Amino acid sequence: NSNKELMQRRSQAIPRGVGQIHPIFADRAENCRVWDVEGREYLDFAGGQAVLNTGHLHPKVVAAVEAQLKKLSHTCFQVLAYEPYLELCEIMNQKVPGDFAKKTLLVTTGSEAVENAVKIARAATKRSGTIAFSGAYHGRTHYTLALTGKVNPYSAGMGLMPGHVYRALYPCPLHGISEDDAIASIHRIFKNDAAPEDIAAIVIEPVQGEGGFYASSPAFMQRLRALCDEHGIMLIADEVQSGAGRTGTLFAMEQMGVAPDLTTFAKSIAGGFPLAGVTGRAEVMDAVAPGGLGGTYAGNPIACVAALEVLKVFEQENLLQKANDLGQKLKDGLLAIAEKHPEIGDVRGLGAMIAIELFEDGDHNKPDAKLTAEIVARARDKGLILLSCGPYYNVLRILVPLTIEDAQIRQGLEIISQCFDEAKQ
Amino acid sequence: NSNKELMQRRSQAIPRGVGQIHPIFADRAENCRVWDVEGREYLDFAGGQAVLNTGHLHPKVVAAVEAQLKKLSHTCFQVLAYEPYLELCEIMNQKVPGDFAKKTLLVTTGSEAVENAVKIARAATKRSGTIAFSGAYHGRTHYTLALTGKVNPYSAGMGLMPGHVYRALYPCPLHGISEDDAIASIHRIFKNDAAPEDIAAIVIEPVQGEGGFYASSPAFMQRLRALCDEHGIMLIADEVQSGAGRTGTLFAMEQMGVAPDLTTFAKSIAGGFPLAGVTGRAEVMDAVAPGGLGGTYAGNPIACVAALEVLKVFEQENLLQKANDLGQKLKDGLLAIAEKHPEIGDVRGLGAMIAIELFEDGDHNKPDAKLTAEIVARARDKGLILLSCGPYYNVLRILVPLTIEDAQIRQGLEIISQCFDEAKQ
Amino acid sequence: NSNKELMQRRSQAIPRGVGQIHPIFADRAENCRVWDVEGREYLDFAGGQAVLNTGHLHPKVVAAVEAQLKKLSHTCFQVLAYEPYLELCEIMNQKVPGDFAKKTLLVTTGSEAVENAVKIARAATKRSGTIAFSGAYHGRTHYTLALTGKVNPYSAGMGLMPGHVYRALYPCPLHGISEDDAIASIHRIFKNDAAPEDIAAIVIEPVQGEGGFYASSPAFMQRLRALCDEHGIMLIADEVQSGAGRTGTLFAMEQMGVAPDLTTFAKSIAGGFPLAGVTGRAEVMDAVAPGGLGGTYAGNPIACVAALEVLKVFEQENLLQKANDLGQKLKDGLLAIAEKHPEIGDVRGLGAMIAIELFEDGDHNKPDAKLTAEIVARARDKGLILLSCGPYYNVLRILVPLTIEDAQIRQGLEIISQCFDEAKQ
Amino acid sequence: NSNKELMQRRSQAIPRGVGQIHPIFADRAENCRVWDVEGREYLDFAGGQAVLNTGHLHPKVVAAVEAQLKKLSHTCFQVLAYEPYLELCEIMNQKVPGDFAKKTLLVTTGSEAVENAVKIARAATKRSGTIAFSGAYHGRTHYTLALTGKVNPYSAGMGLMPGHVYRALYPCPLHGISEDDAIASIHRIFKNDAAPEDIAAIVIEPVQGEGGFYASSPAFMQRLRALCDEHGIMLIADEVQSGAGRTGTLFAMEQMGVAPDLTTFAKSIAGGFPLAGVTGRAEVMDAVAPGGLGGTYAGNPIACVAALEVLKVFEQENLLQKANDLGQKLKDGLLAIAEKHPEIGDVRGLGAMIAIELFEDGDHNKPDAKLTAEIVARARDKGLILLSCGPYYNVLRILVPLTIEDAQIRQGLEIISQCFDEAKQ
Numbered sequence A, B, C, D: 001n002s003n004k005e006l007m008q009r010r011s012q013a014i015p016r017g018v019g020q021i022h023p024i025f026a027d028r029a030e031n032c033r034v035w036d037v038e039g040r041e042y043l044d045f046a047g048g049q050a051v052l053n054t055g056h057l058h059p060k061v062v063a064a065v066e067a068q069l070k071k072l073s074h075t076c077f078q079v080l081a082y083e084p085y086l087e088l089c090e091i092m093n094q095k096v097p098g099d100f101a102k103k104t105l106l107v108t109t110g111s112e113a114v115e116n117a118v119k120i121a122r123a124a125t126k127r128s129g130t131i132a133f134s135g136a137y138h139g140r141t142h143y144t145l146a147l148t149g150k151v152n153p154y155s156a157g158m159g160l161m162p163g164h165v166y167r168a169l170y171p172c173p174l175h176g177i178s179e180d181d182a183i184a185s186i187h188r189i190f191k192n193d194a195a196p197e198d199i200a201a202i203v204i205e206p207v208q209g210e211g212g213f214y215a216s217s218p219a220f221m222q223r224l225r226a227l228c229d230e231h232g233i234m235l236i237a238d239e240v241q242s243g244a245g246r247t248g249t250l251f252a253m254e255q256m257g258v259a260p261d262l263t264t265f266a267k268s269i270a271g272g273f274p275l276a277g278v279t280g281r282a283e284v285m286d287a288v289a290p291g292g293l294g295g296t297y298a299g300n301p302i303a304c305v306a307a308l309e310v311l312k313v314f315e316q317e318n319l320l321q322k323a324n325d326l327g328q329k330l331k332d333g334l335l336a337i338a339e340k341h342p343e344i345g346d347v348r349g350l351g352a353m354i355a356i357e358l359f360e361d362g363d364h365n366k367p368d369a370k371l372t373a374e375i376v377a378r379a380r381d382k383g384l385i386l387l388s389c390g391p392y393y394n395v396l397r398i399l400v401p402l403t404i405e406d407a408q409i410r411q412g413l414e415i416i417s418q419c420f421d422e423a424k425q
Ligand SMILES: Cc1ncc(COP(=O)(O)O)c(CN)c1O
Pocket: A109, A110, A111, A112, A114, A137, A138, A139, A140, A205, A209, A210, A238, A239, A240, A241, A242, A266, A267, B295, B296, B297
């Protein structure tokens, strides 16, 4: 029952392919606190990878889950239905941006959600190709690995992933890719490899997660929407990570000024329970013939009641406003730290989807991956759990539960401050 | 709060692609009993589609789940580990057949397990192709739909699924496909479309589920194993449905006299909680580099403890012996009904994976899909939940919990018997 | 000079990937005779691989070529047209079977012809998949290698060829594949891997060439034509080898009682000059937008006049009739030899597309690849050029020019007769 | 017998997909002169699309062709060899750039050459993927259409072409793509879609043909070579159009300062006869096992002696030097015309591979496709045959025979001048 001991057993029974960011075995948790098997307490700034916007075991969520456990945990919706699945669908049809009739499909994981959105876009348009962006992340199934703009390590050593997935450039001025370059990269696909008539959908993260927490501007998103409309291409917004309130609105697309045809959600939607889904223009969703959509565990009963509670908690605890306030506080603190450390070349984020990006001597073409990894390690040593990301591994992101305590905001920022001070020594 | 009312709401909020076998909304359940929103009771012979071998809400399983709910529900193993994931892996490494050391990856859905078994086989052999069988069912992601030997409705209207998946014939003498034809169909692939050096794996269900409950014979499975050994090809046993004790042994491969290189499992492994996995040769599992395997919800903590308890219950309540006793009582009972109804052309099954196949006037060339569906509808009217399957929709399968009580076995057979009799006028 | 000296230079300047059936360098040839650089004379029973139905350098063909050579050899039709191309197309439109308007595309090689026929079927049906048959041979480009039903050596060591080509079984009672098995295999594809709505074409050789000189029966071709009509699938007859008179009619489909949608031709169409083409249902051919069809050397002027001259020669010289007479004499002569040599298990062929298949001890399950190779070697030492074929390399085919004299037919059979006698001594 | 009547017959016998740049039917030609069926004479600045660098029917080439026509026209090299094939291979092994042992394969068309070079590279590296550049042109087979950086019209309406072909950006400063952008676009592929370990080759035209006569700089080519060397990727130089002396040297790579691993050649290699081939590092070429390379008409006897004669003519008549002189006279004359017409935004070219690009009011952002088309039509009315190209159809290219007479160069330039003036009036 020591972390080391458990890691030894892990090497024996579990594949090295399953990475381990922190060699620690968590035992119990509560809101933003996690205790490992040795009793040490940590402040969780990773949030189970953006899955815990309402924190570990939110009391209301757990209470709803415990009540559902008295009724049933599974029937397989496609065989025998149940109300929690229906209710969530009804609520998502209203909450997802788009001033038009929508329908919702529930599945189990974010990769399944993206898979289903594409199968739906293909059926609706009678086309087979898709376009995804550089640095994108959409899942670990063969097809979402192809959609994912990163081979190593997600699909490394496995041979080539499915074809007919084309690569566009994600707008990112910080790294010299203008919105014009991004829109131009799409037309390039049209002229060089796949005409519009063969593209069923363009998949994009309103705010890239693993890609580096880079956000699309409303203007860029508006150009994209116009491009899709012109060519009858479905716009799929993958909000698995940006969704469930992380950016200050339930869905980031609300802040773009345009609505997508399809939206994928997961992670924080059920606050720590396995659930995912796709909500979209009704006519598009209905394109698949009966029997064409499913999944054994899809819209698991317990996960659904959990999601329903999460939605009510956002409303009751005013978490969207808190997300925004937390974001301002984190960025202000991060900018203060930045004044003493030029390596921090950018502080950014919508709502609580905050990140800082490190550069050697603030040199924007020199991603500082060693410092980023060093800060993560030093933070773990000070009891703070962090995650990094970015195609060059030089981005630190903050995904702490929105339910965080005032004291914990100070605590996390203080610990980060120390890490940069002690790394520079 | 009426089934019809909820069905109307379903039709407006959920896409038609999500099918519905029984237009009923379950409210609560216990072991083999299910109650709908109207208070009507049903005997569940579908088991959430082979997910409830230990019954709805087995008390031991629920108690384990409730204890974990007091600790944590999610951290994302790849970020912070936890003991329930590690303990289940160790047990699965022991329980899945094979005299070599195994390693286990836990994910969430059956589709993901198959996806990962193939990725792992590709990384291990450094090959990209795979072979799957006619009538096979492996999931609803783009790649598993390609593996699935059934286009309609699973991938209907969507265009061609991922290439480089070759089709072999599942052995099935009842319908003229000999074991020699089956093996010859694999050599044909080697000769005509993809040499052995390009085939990473051959995926097979030891007992096809959706395909019609057709079982491979040990002899066949041994020829398959030998063919794979000869070519360095990974044998992937998809036991998502056949697994977790349905055939009288924990895994069907135990009755085949050979061990596969990789085994996928899900559905009944956690008795009603979202979990799936892949267990196989340790050096094959480790072929994928760190960071190449995962998934946000993978090995969800609550589902892991649920699974550990399910395995304990199989042992304490002697469910494997019960599966075999249940299977015999069911087959004896159906063979009885078959005496008065020639349409019942075959009664079969390993352990409790039982099925009957209907033919118009016992003519094996005339699948009776109409009678099949009628029996399903009549049974529901009598309070019995059934599922059919098979490429010709003329197979009735029984997936009732292995924890069913003796009187319920009689009750169910009695209802089935009544359905056939009444179907005669 | 010396054949061996040239072979030595060959090994140093040319990749070993280019096979050499006969280690002999030809210097001159005429009709059915070939003389090597050592002055040795050979009776050519291979016909440049079915390219010389009108014999080496037919005087009429040569005179037409010389006349054209004084005018121009190339302009690239797509840039500046020329009459010989136009004229050939008009004649092929009327001569290729099909009681409906047709258009003809001229390219250069047989592989290009097949490539374009599939491209045209895809544009006409707006579908991307194709079906080809076991043991088929369609060319050496990436896509035709996928269509080709034989991986080694055509595409050995190169990794997997293009996907979305599905495999059906070619009817062959001799080796246990009935017509019902063949058609069932097509429906199997529709059920398991690609719905009819995703198949642009079914490609078939009315008489397989490399596959072993196995011919389709009119009854089978008719079931196949009806299956295509029912699903809107284009039937492509690849007559690159069976065409230009080899079977007794200009095209083998003529003897099938049904017409294909598209026909590819090459080899013998130009009597020894580079030319290939696609003739088919006009509205299908016109489905491709201008600029979509071409090739720099396409419908080479010199090869076009040679082809026009070849058609006239078939008429003026009664070659179709002669092909039938030649085929009968060859089969009668081969059957006489078969009375003394049990290894000859089958003597078959339409028109002059004649082959015999060798089996060890006359057992249809024991192909005798060694004996076949031995006969080719012995025949060569006796001044007779032969080619073998078949997936088991135990089929000897006869592709001698249709212009052969009676004495040479007798002579060819005697030589063959002696090779069998001396192979058994 | 008028161009009009022949164009009408054409509309009825030939598919519309076969485009027709000039609605004229040629009857005969000599060097750079062409006469149509109406007896009108034209000055050919298109060279049969870069195929006639030694002019129409060069008397030395014709005499070589006539000598061979008396011996044999076809045997199928892979069946029975002949010396003309072997001798050209030996010469190309020496002529193709690269200070190391090489081997040569002869096929028939440029697309078949690219096809085989890729197959060879895949076999040599044991990798399945390839990278090609934007605006590239490599042929009309399925795979070369995927390699081709232009969907319309080459593969328009045919569905998606073969996957696993990735797109890099060709360096073109005139349009804003720096060499750094080009090289970075390759690393982007490695990072986002296909690791170097899965890329067998990078295919590039030293000077893009259809692409717009845009040439790679030695610096860029050297960077590409260093990149390929680092990753074990084969650099395939497609010189089908740039080769056979068009750029001032036999092969353009000679001017790049580095040698490709494989080179494709066709068009002008045989002065108007169907031939093409691939020459490469011996060890790379030998990677394919015997029987893996071929083609019925491959290295046709008559085209081989024509290519041999073409190479002698280049040496004897110093056509490489003339290419350079012609190039200079063309640019000087075109530059002169550019002063009176600002629409000519660029005059460029290595050797005799000359082009000018038209912009709407010198605005490089406004490709003048309409003026380009007008000039072609006016030139034709004036007796001069020209061809345009470029992704935006605003590039006029000159592929006039290198054997052109001085007065004709002036004649041609004068006509182009009048076209621009009159188009402006
Ligand atoms: C944008 C995005 N899309 C899809 C997924 C896949 O979700 P899951 O891991 O739940 O399958 C993730 C998870 N990291 C994600 O961030």
